[PDB]
């Protein structure tokens, strides 16, 4: 079959890592300073 | 902290008008690391003074919500 040659090729490719910046926890995300706080008079 | 949370019940049992003591029952319960009794007083509490304006019980619920993080719409709230 003597036709137009294109090739067929479905692009399902995984990216890579992104590896974004982190955040950074509050002082009261951590139990201690939360129990500091709570406890206040 | 077990002398104060029972001078709190003592208090809150002879009038129950005293929000602060059960707020400070409440953070008794906190600083024995009775977290859960203290999530269950609260609710209790809430659910039987939704018109009430405790504006610092609604904080700590929110700070609470937000530990246990499954409540977060209530935290929100």
Redesign the interface.
């Given at each position: 079959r003597q036709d137009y040659i294109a090739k067929v090729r479905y692009q399902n490719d995984l990216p890579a890592p992104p590896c974004p910046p982190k955040l950074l926890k509050y002082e009261?995300e951590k139990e201690a300073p939360?129990?500091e706080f709570?406890?206040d008079s | 902290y077990v002398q104060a949370q029972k001078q709190f019940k003592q208090a809150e049992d002879s009038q129950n008008s005293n929000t602060l003591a059960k707020l400070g029952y409440a953070?008794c319960l906190?600083?024995r690391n009775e977290v859960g009794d203290a999530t269950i007083y609260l609710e209790k509490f809430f659910k039987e003074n939704q018109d009430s304006k405790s504006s610092e019980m609604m904080l700590?619920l929110g700070?609470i919500y937000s530990?246990s993080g499954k409540s977060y719409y209530k935290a929100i709230i």
């Open positions: 009261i939360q129990k709570l406890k | 953070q906190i600083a700590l700070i530990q």
